[PDB]
Design a protein around this ligand. Structure first.
Ligand SMILES: [Ca+2]
Ligand SMILES: [Ca+2]
Ligand SMILES: [Ca+2]
Ligand SMILES: [Ca+2]
Ligand SMILES: [Zn+2]
Length: 316
């Protein structure tokens, strides 16, 4: 829409009040002109035609319950935008300030969210397994991060390259969570998963096995389900990432944590300069060690921790 940049206010899914960047032209649209070539939020209106219609509001106030998923999808895309730009000097997902678009209210009772090749899509959940999935900043950043991957490494969505693809989204989703610094953790999706059960989550990076995911190569899934276990086997890599940052002793192998900023730096580099569409785990090991070397010296602690971490998850 051509119009003037304005600022609306509303409440997100969890009931928090936030300001959002809107665009005015008769109606107030969920169109943020303050970030790259824009952030654009649409209403799929319980259907599956995408992206749907650019979100339109009469008064620039977004406090209705129907509005809440849109408020959050819009705002957290912005937050994720600023993480990549401020932290990795990356302008949107293609690196050239591509427009970021999101649709909410996708289908009915849809317990998921995803990147479809062109845009982010968020269901409202069935209210039992999930509440609207854009309520989770780690979920939003996970999904936009798939855009980053597709444009960089382009890790094929299957088997080990696919489990790396998923881990990368989980890792950057968490780092963005930490960045906004609101109840951050190394769990995925806890903010919108099972509103009836407290303390749980979709996946854990710190201990993948809490939800049956593997935390060592030797427990890798090799079946055909989940595109070859892309959301399963990512636990092995998420664990490595966790340990690289936070440290610990896993199956008796000790890792000195180097903190999440360095993790972030090492894995963005790996993602942007060494990983390829068909990279496997062992190849990820090599990319990250080289990334760390590039960054802090072949004999740095950073390099040594990265090795320790991959050792601990059984990845040579
Ligand atoms: Ca309104
Ligand atoms: Ca959290
Ligand atoms: Ca989280
Ligand atoms: Ca829950
Ligand atoms: Zn994903």
């Amino acid at each position: 829409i051509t119009g003037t940049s304005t600022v609306g206010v509303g409440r997100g899914v969890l009931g928090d009040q936030k300001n959002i960047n809107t665009t005015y032209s008769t109606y107030y649209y969920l169109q943020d002109n303050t970030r790259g070539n824009g952030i654009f939020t649409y209403d799929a209106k319980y259907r599956t035609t995408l992206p749907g219609s650019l979100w339109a509001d009469a008064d620039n106030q977004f406090f209705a319950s129907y509005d809440a998923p849109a408020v959050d999808a819009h705002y957290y895309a912005g937050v994720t935008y600023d993480y990549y730009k401020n932290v990795h000097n990356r302008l949107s997902y293609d690196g050239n300030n591509a427009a970021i678009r999101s649709s909410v209210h996708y289908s009915q009772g849809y317990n998921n969210a995803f990147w479809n090749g062109s845009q982010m899509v968020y269901g409202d959940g069935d209210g039992q397994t999930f509440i609207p999935l854009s309520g989770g900043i780690d979920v939003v950043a996970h999904e936009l991060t798939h855009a980053v991957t597709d444009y960089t490494a382009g890790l094929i969505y299957q088997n080990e390259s696919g489990a790396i693809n998923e881990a990368i989204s989980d890792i950057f989703g968490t780092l963005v969570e930490f960045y906004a610094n609101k109840n951050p953790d190394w769990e995925i999706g806890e903010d919108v998963y099972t509103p009836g059960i407290s303390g749980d989550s979709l996946r854990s990076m710190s201990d993948p096995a809490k939800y049956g995911d593997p935390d060592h190569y030797s427990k890798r899934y090799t079946g055909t389900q989940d595109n070859g276990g892309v959301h399963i086997n990512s636990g092995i890599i998420n664990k490595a990432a966790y340990l690289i940052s936070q440290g610990g002793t896993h199956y008796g192998v000790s890792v000195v944590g180097i903190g999440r900023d360095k993790l972030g730096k090492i894995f963005y580099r790996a993602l942007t300069q060494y990983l390829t569409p068909t990279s496997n785990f062992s190849q990820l090991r090599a990319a990250a060690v080289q990334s760390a070397t590039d960054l802090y010296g072949s004999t740095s602690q950073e390099v040594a921790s990265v090795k320790q971490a991959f050792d601990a998850v059984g990845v040579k």
